[PDB]
């Protein structure tokens, strides 16, 4: 019986890690490194997800930009993030109920698995939307800030890590319900 | 001559990361119908058209159809791009 418990708790901790990645990219400090070292003068952008920093050293807001329909894509994006987090927390809650019975079960666990799948389904869409938006932000001449060092992460990759956290959670818990 | 990269060129790396993650997401769904077993079955799904052995609809077989449609679209787009 120690085996199933170790599997379950391991999956719980893994999904907790995924939540840490969720917080990680929800708290991105610079989504993309950026530069415009114009031979004007040298420039180094550091675009946080809601916080376009410049680097003397400075960080700036710059959120909710062009254009309109894209802003709505941001709405769907953030809503998808919130529901993502909700499915996470419901997952951990169903895990805690499993702990309470460790202190349906199957019928409950699969539910969380499903939600976690849904969670994984949403954020992977969400980031697309975000990346979609980001490309669009680059596509429309980003005011002046159009860095050549275009690149995602670091934290966005962690958003994927929380994704695969929910994924592995769902897989191992499915391995548990298959019992 | 490019090494390896030239094959990679027609479709962006990000798109690859996306198709990979998406497939991984599709993969587990088959297990829900039932970490290794049905994931292996999904490995038996991408390899050939899409999914099998579903006792008429059930649940994930329609996922197999959507997945078939999906991989179909992507490979078509890829080939068109290289062209």
């Amino acid at each position: 019986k120690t085996s199933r418990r170790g599997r379950a708790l391991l999956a719980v901790a893994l999904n907790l890690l995924a939540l840490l990645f969720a917080t990680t990219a929800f708290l991105t400090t610079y989504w993309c490194q950026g530069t415009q070292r114009v031979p004007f003068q040298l420039r180094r952008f550091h675009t946080g997800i809601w916080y376009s920093c410049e680097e003397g050293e400075k960080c700036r807001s710059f959120i909710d930009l062009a254009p309109a329909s894209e802003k709505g894509v941001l709405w769907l994006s953030v809503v998808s993030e919130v529901l993502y987090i909700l499915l996470l927390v419901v997952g951990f809650s169903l895990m805690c109920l499993e702990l309470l019975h460790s202190s349906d079960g199957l019928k409950l666990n699969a539910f969380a698995a499903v939600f976690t799948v849904l969670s994984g389904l949403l954020g992977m869409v969400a980031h697309m939307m975000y990346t979609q938006v980001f490309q669009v932000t680059v596509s429309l001449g980003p005011e002046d800030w159009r860095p050549h060092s275009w690149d995602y992460g670091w934290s966005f990759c962690l958003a994927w890590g929380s994704f695969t956290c929910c994924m592995a959670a769902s897989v191992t818990t499915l391995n548990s319900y298959t019992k | 001559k490019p090494g390896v990269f030239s094959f990679l060129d027609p479709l962006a790396y990000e798109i690859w990361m996306c198709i990979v993650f998406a497939y991984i997401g599709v993969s587990v769904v088959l297990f829900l119908v039932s970490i290794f077993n049905s994931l292996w079955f999904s490995l038996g799904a991408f390899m050939q058209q899409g999914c099998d052995i579903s006792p008429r609809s059930l649940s994930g077989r329609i996922v197999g159809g959507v997945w078939w449609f999906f991989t179909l679209i992507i490979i078509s787009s890829y080939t068109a791009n290289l062209a």
Binding site: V114, L118, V125 | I62
Partner: peptide, 29 residues
């Protein structure tokens, strides 16, 4: 990546729909 992302959307949506079908099928039983 966008033009394909639109297909990602229908993919994921089909996934969730099929999941709902799995749920009601778990409801009959």
């Amino acid at each position: 990546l966008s033009n394909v992302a639109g297909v990602f959307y229908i993919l994921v949506g089909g996934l969730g729909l099929a999941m709902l079908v799995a749920l009601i099928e778990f409801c009959y039983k």
